[PDB]
């Protein structure tokens, strides 16, 4: 029989391993051109303490018109302070995060963090403009927001011993 602790022990080594790798990759740069940062993967793992939830939300899907809460995630990787907005996938992922971020300055390790860069269609309808209510679209900066899916795991370190392990293993 395999013990359930082996799940907690696999994510122990999975979090710390992916932390070292991606931490270095984020210091180096997120995808230098066509995949050439350091270790180019879709999902990363890092550590930071909870800042705040922004009062505003982000429209993540136009078809089904859903907006997701902003969990402000800034941390100093090496020299640079990477300040990007942590997002949730579903309503269940949003609610578990807001119920988890009850403690401010909560130092946790966000595992399996899937980065999403903003974009849209670009050629224009030029037709069926009867649906329009007179509203010309404003200029939005296409930023990358760090999405948290249902495969993600946010591990809270109540102490600073796992933080100690990670920062001394990575080094800057």
């Amino acid at each position: 029989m395999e013990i359930e602790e082996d799940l907690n022990l696999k994510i122990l080594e999975d979090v710390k391993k992916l932390y070292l790798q991606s931490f270095d990759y984020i210091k180096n740069g997120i995808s230098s051109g066509g995949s050439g940062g350091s270790i180019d993967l879709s999902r990363i793992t890092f550590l930071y303490k909870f800042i705040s939830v922004n009062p505003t939300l982000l429209l993540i899907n136009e078809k089904t018109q859903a907006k997701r809460r902003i969990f402000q995630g800034e941390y100093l990787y090496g020299k640079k302070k990477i300040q990007f907005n942590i997002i949730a996938k579903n309503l269940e992922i949003e609610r578990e995060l807001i119920q988890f971020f009850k403690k401010p300055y909560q130092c946790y390790i966000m595992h399996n963090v899937q980065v999403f860069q903003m974009l849209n269609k670009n050629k224009n309808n030029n037709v069926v403009e009867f649906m329009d209510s007179e509203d010309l679209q404003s200029s939005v900066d296409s930023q990358l927001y760090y999405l948290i899916d249902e495969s993600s795991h946010v591990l809270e370190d109540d102490s600073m011993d796992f933080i100690s392990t990670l920062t001394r293993l990575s080094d800057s």
């Binding site: 899907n61 136009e62 078809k63 980065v115 999403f116 860069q117 903003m118 974009l119 990358l144 999405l147």
Partner: peptide, 14 residues
Amino acid sequence: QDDFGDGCLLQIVN
């Protein structure tokens, strides 16, 4: 369909 699926305002870096 899906929040981050086809018809999203954001696509995964890959």
